[PDB]
């Protein structure tokens, strides 16, 4: 059977490495999260209205009058947060174990990451709260950076002089349509990978030890799905407002602006970098590079060993990178004042210097220690 041929090839009789840890669960979790988001998003779309007079009213009507509508809405919000948690851990697995040498898979990945960030940004604009409106304006005016092409482009997205209904409705249309493009790009992501097979934490050729996927990494993915569902629900049913922001529960006032404005947690590392660079344009570029530096990552691998299991100096540099990524996430939250700014400036300098300079030099030193260089 043609279909079963395909089915057996990507999920049942696929030869997988026997020694991949729980981190390799995370990408499958991302796919599940995508479906969960789509399903919850569809059940938000049967009652949401993309009109600036009625968007907040429709969201409150979902939370108060639709049967279990609060459940689907907070599942959607905390599932976006769970999506970004699993995305960050997936990218960290790819950075740590040398999986970026699968270059086409890595580039389709960073395209997926850009698409997911754009989808989450427009989705956060969608409830039309105080925080959504000022966040949109701010993040969009960012586009106003480009000197000749930027200004017009901004109002083009804004569809007018300033974000207003024109934006909300087109942001609803985009935010609806992009997760299906994300699903298609994820299918391309899976294809570009099966051509090469998954990597293992030792970083070695695992062709001598491969097992089926149906009984070994399926029940493992089912267990990971169950644990991820435990964390999501316990972040919806018990701590539903933990990851959100209180000022989004006020209606969008163009005349007032929330005093303390901040992007959601996931977009902060970038926020910090942007704020750090004095020049507006510089910030925008660095911000982009922040995400793009990853794509650049497969050309910076100067070691003869694929994984970091046997590479302790680059392990130390990797955990310092995770450390100042957490620092940049914290700084974004902090307001503009001493000494948060300096940390932000250093943390950004250290982030770019560790990824660009320190890891290939350390890999050269590690190759010299094993009498290879």
């Amino acid at each position: 059977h043609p279909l079963f041929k395909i089915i057996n090839h990507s999920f049942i009789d696929l030869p997988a490495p026997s020694n991949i840890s729980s981190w390799w669960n995370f990408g499958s979790l991302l796919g599940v999260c995508l479906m969960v988001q789509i399903i919850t998003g569809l059940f938000l779309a049967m009652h949401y209205t993309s009109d600036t007079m009625t968007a907040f009213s429709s969201v409150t009507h979902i939370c108060r009058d639709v049967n279990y509508g609060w459940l689907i809405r907070y599942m959607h919000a905390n599932g976006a947060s769970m999506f970004f948690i699993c995305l960050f851990l997936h990218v960290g697995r790819g950075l740590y174990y040398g999986s970026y040498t699968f270059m086409e898979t890595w580039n389709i990945g960073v395209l997926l990451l850009f698409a997911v960030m754009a989808t989450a940004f427009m989705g956060y604009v969608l409830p039309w709260g105080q925080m959504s409106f000022w966040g949109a304006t701010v993040i969009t005016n960012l586009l106003s950076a480009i000197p000749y092409i930027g200004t017009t482009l901004v109002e083009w997205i804004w569809g007018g002089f300033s974000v207003d209904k024109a934006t909300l409705t087109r942001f609803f249309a985009f935010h609806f349509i992009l997760p299906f493009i994300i699903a298609a790009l994820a299918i391309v992501h899976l294809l570009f990978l099966h051509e090469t097979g998954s990597n293992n934490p030792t970083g070695l050729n695992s062709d001598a030890d491969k097992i089926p996927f149906h009984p070994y990494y399926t029940i493992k993915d089912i267990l990971g799905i169950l644990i991820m569902f435990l964390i999501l629900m316990t972040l919806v049913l018990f701590f539903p407002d933990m990851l959100g922001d209180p000022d989004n529960y006020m209606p969008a006032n163009p005349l007032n602006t929330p005093p303390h404005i901040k992007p959601e947690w996931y977009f902060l590392f970038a926020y910090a970098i942007l704020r750090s660079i004095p020049n507006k344009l510089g910030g925008v570029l660095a911000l982009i590079l922040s995400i793009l530096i990853l794509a650049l990552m497969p050309f910076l691998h100067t070691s003869k060993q694929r994984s970091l299991m046997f590479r302790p100096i680059t392990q130390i540099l990797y955990w310092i990178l995770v450390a100042n990524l957490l620092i940049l996430t914290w700084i974004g939250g902090q307001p503009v004042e001493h000494p948060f700014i300096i940390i932000g400036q250093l943390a950004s300098i250290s982030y770019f210097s560790i990824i660009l300079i320190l890891m290939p030099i350390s890999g050269i030193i590690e190759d010299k220690m094993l009498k290879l260089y």
């Binding site: 490495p17 026997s18 030792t202 003869k304 694929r306 046997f310 590479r311 302790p312 094993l370």
Partner: protein, 98 residues
């Protein structure tokens, strides 16, 4: 430097899985050409060592300390064969520029 290299060899940790240094090389085109040129017994020992290391990583175990790979004992078997691959590779390259 010799003692600090032994300390780094212990800190790298592939000897605890029973691996050699040349087992840990990333299989690029030159490395696969050097592996293909190995004799049958060395290739079979390399494949068994890699399979045992993968099994130990699956069970999250290491070998007992008497079974680890002593830094002094590790043999750089693929190295000789590899240099040639690189040498030949470079020669062809320069000739290309000719």
């Amino acid at each position: 430097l010799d003692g600090f290299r032994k300390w780094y060899y212990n800190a790298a940790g592939f000897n605890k899985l029973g691996l050699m240094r040349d087992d840990t090389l990333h299989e690029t085109e030159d490395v696969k050409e050097a592996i293909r040129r190995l004799p049958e017994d060395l290739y079979n020992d390399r494949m068994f060592r890699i399979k045992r290391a993968l099994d130990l990583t699956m069970r999250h175990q290491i070998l007992p300390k008497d079974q680890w790979t002593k830094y002094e004992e590790d043999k750089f078997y693929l190295e000789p064969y590899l240099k040639e691959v690189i040498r030949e590779r470079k020669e062809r390259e320069e000739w290309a520029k000719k």
